[PDB]
Design a protein around this ligand. Sequence first.
Ligand SMILES: OCc1cn([C@@H]2CCCN(c3ncnc4[nH]ccc34)C2)nn1
Length: 167
Amino acid sequence: VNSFSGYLKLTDNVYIKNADIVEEAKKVKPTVVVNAANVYLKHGGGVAGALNKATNNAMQVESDDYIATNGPLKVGGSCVLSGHNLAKHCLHVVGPNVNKGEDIQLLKSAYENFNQHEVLLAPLLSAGIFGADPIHSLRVCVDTVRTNVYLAVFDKNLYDKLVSSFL
Ligand SMILES: OCc1cn([C@@H]2CCCN(c3ncnc4[nH]ccc34)C2)nn1
């Protein structure tokens, strides 16, 4: 039993809710919240900008030190950093950004990072300002992640479309 509430069950291990991931993280304080990161961990907009803003920019400060030490992530890769006031840990995962021409096949590699964590609160990777089709992202999630994932979808209209079209 866990504290996630109001989710629709899609499969054995994947759950979905119309929710603001920032507000959901604040309330659940999950072990792991996933950030929709870029390789530079520049958390300017989308989910990343919202998560970082909720940490009062502490996520960005920590991220800048990480990059200065380690260099950029790979597209499809991830790193574990602090969850600050939102979660124990933040798993920063880089999905491909279609608006940069990155290969959508890397979306599966991106979701594979979730399998290193037993339970996660997450957005749909490569959705929103990353330019991929969220219906496809949900399909890859379901077909790749084997651990327990609680997906937060900000837009109510999109949430309803994702549920209604789910196979
Ligand atoms: O159409 C509106 C819309 C845009 N996006 C992008 C794409 C990926 C998912 N998403 C978020 N997912 C959960 N929480 C959030 N808070 C703030 C953003 C957010 C950001 N999603 N819906």
